[PDB]
Design a protein around this ligand. Structure first.
Ligand code: HEM
Length: 188
């Protein structure tokens, strides 16, 4: 997992559960105190899993609930650390550019496996976004979407269209419907 992104999760976990829980969890995996992660750094997915397992143990909360809460709260963290991706954008534009952003931020990582997040308009007021990744981080995915709605102050309804798993890849397709129209038909 891209290091700086794990960095956002650490900050978000501190916001949710406190420095004691987080410090203890990072200590359990040998994380240097006040460790600063650099842009080219990659952090083992298993290390991330172990950090979250410790937070779960200490807070008594199920790991899936933690990922859901982290997703909901991490958008704020992203808006502070990566402000350029939010400036002058509407929620629909933000969501539609995510697939490209994830490809961009993982390009120079050995064995890059970013999640695919292809979104496609399906109506004047809705898009279908399909999460595809071997990591099966459904709760985090859904949480970020909810947090994005809150950050952009644009109400949406989210319905699952379908989910599945094949050859190690998990997929979750959701239909995101906006209160007001966001698209209009134009000649192709
Ligand atoms: C400006 C905001 C965002 C940035 C900069 C960003 C960046 C990233 C990056 C680089 C990773 C690491 C991937 C890897 O190392 O393979 C990641 C993970 C992830 N991102 Fe984002 N992300 C943002 C917003 C979102 C949003 C809005 C969604 C979903 C609607 C999303 C869904 C995910 C998921 C589910 C993962 C977890 C890894 C996986 O499932 O395979 N991200 N993000």
């Amino acid at each position: 997992m891209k290091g700086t992104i794990v960095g956002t999760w650490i900050k978000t976990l501190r916001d949710l559960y406190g420095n004691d829980v987080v410090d203890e969890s990072l200590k359990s995996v040998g994380w240097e105190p006040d460790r600063v992660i650099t842009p080219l750094e990659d952090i083992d997915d298993d290390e991330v899993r172990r950090i979250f397992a410790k937070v779960s143990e200490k807070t008594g909360k199920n790991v899936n609930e933690i990922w859901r809460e982290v997703g909901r709260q991490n958008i704020k963290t992203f808006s502070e650390w990566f402000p350029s991706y939010f400036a002058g954008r509407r929620l629909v534009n933000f969501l539609m550019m995510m697939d490209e952003v994830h490809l961009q931020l993982t390009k120079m990582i050995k064995g890059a496996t970013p999640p695919r997040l292809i979104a496609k308009p399906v109506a004047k007021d809705a898009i279908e976004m399909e999460y595809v990744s071997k990591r099966k981080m459904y709760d985090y995915f859904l949480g970020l979407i909810e947090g994005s709605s809150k950050f952009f102050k644009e109400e949406i309804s989210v319905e699952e269209v379908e989910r599945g798993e094949k050859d190690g890849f998990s997929r979750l397709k959701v239909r995101i419907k906006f209160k007001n129209p966001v698209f209009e038909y134009k000649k192709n």
